[PDB]
Ligand SMILES: *[C@](O)(C(=O)NCc1ccccc1)[C@H](C[C@@H]1CCCNC1=O)NC(=O)[C@H](CC1CCCCC1)NC(=O)c1cc2ccccc2o1
């Protein structure tokens with residue numbers, strides 16, 4: 001028993017982190033087979049961030065303008081190209097530590113582990129969710145660009161995020177590993193800001209099931225609700241609408257606890273309306289939305 | 304910016320996890336150089352857990368009663384011994400992936416990363432604190448025994464915990480890597496229970512400094528306190544007494560934020576007395592005590 005915000009073991013990703021330098025700009029890159037992936041703004045100077053034309057900047061570079069360092073070993077760059085907002089540097093050596101991997105573009109509400117890295121060196125690992133507003137509430141300092149987010153499934157690393165920037169509210173924005181931003185953001189300095197966010201309802205319900213699995217039951221009630229009356233109150237509290245697909249996703253947790261999904265929705269309605277009255281759930285005094293139904297199942301009854 | 308419950312990258316420890324089997328009992332072991340470390344209760348049957356005499360049980364075993372599996376490879380056991388509550392199995396092959404490492408016995412209030420593992424296979428990584436009552440609030444299922452806790456410091460892994468059991472409140476107990484339990488617990492089935500716990504005051508103060516570094520300031524006030532009046536209210540709220548050594552430890556964070564330690568104590572006093580009144584600090588509606596001063600410094604201004 002017990003329930004923690006657990007990240008995936010990070011070793012498979014650690015073996016892929018490298019340092020990329022162009023001019024005076026250094027950031028992290030991801031070295032898979034004979035390719036190194038990094039944010040294209042490594043080719044930017046201080047003068048170019050306002051409105052850069054990356055096609056222009058890149059055509060003015062050659063392979064030798066890119067210094068890739070993997071541990072102590074320098075990797076020679078033998079080709080370079082741009083794909084959306086990521087630069088791909090072909091190197092003359094395939095990473096011997098390449099895991100089985102794929103690139104995935106995730107949906108909002110999905111979770112993933114971030115390996116924070118500086119100068120190609122991993123610093124820490126933590127779990128987070130893609131917010132409905134396409135930002136992530138990370139922990140990133142100067143030099144963290146190029147750090148990646150990922151899930152692991154039976155020894156296959158699915159990479160889903162590459163870090164690019166910090167927004168004025170202190171939340172973070174970035175791309176999939178094919179260089180497409182999550183949300184409306186662009187890699188230039190503009191007035192862009194996070195839109196209004198919402199709470200990930202299906203995840204809150206998953207976490208309430210985790211609490212029951214772990215013996216917190218105080219928030220249950222004898223009531224039920226219809227999906228539409230529930231979605232009425234969710235709209236009121238800035239929660240995402242719950243779909244029938246969400247209900248189907250929550251089926252296994254419902255079956256394991258004997259608590260119908262719409263009954264758990266009646267508990268969530270009561271918690272939204274009444275607060276928690278000085279009590280906690282799984283050691284939190286707030287409703288937690290960073291655990292998917294799959295996260296709960298993995299952690300509570302699996303290995 | 305941003306502040307997350309961040310664990311150490313786990314790769315150096317992943318390369319050391321193995322599976323140990325004795326009879327019908329299987330758990331995790333830690334393979335460093337030519338030694339595998341695991342809980343001695345791997346030699347226990349279902350009939351022996353009440354009051355086992357481990358010297359007896361062990362003298363009745365030979366090297367061939369222990370099956371050690373590292374990935375797909377079987378490791379041959381060539382010696383065995385007991386050290387407190389850990390078994391040491393000398394194997395004929397030194398782990399090629401052994402990191403620079405040491406064994407440390409930590410003090411209550413110190414934090415560390417746990418690599419949860421099942422059948423020698425890492426499942427997840429998370430951060431936690433040794434509680435004042437010498438238990439940890441982990442996330443552990445059947446098969447997790449032998450999973451370890453650790454810190455990393457410049458490529459040296461300091462191992463400080465090995466998992467052994469779950470107490471009736473759902474919290475966890477275990478040993479250092481030399482097999483000495485944290486707290487009064489023993490490796491047998493008895494009425495043992497966690498004692499009353501307290502909140503780790505110096506850590507709460509560290510985390511309030513993290514909040515200031517990150518722009519949460521709403522809880523500050525113009526007041527100061529003396530150490531003794533503060534410790535009076537801390538005693539009242541089941542907080543650990545704050546020492547001058549704690550104050551000295553918090554010095555660098557004080558210096559970086561310009562907030563004297565005793566002034567931050569006056570803020571904590573006000574928060575204890577008044578609650579948070581529907582507000583949050585670093586995304587929490589409770590006062591967080593699982594971050595040491597060193598954790599804050601590492602995460603907020605370092606790599
Ligand atoms: C990222 O580029 C990075 O880590 N670069 C390496 C580095 C090393 C030393 C100093 C700076 C950068 C960086 C990650 C940011 C940094 C700030 C703290 N947390 C983060 O996640 N990303 C940026 O600095 C981006 C750079 C833009 C350049 C043009 C292409 C798009 C990205 N900028 C910002 O994050 C940012 C925040 C902010 C606030 C006010 C004015 C400008 C501004 O930029």
Ligand SMILES: *[C@](O)(C(=O)NCc1ccccc1)[C@H](C[C@@H]1CCCNC1=O)NC(=O)[C@H](CC1CCCCC1)NC(=O)c1cc2ccccc2o1
Pocket residue numbers: 001329330344347352443444445446447448467468469470475489490491492
């Ligand atoms: C740990 O031994 C383990 O993982 N063993 C491998 C394994 C594989 C399959 C089934 C069981 C064990 C295990 C870790 C526990 C398990 C329960 C959930 N969370 C955990 O952390 N540890 C135990 O099972 C210990 C065993 C004792 C045997 C004698 C030496 C001291 C340890 N027991 C308990 O944790 C425990 C909890 C509990 C509650 C009621 C009655 C007995 C009881 O034992």
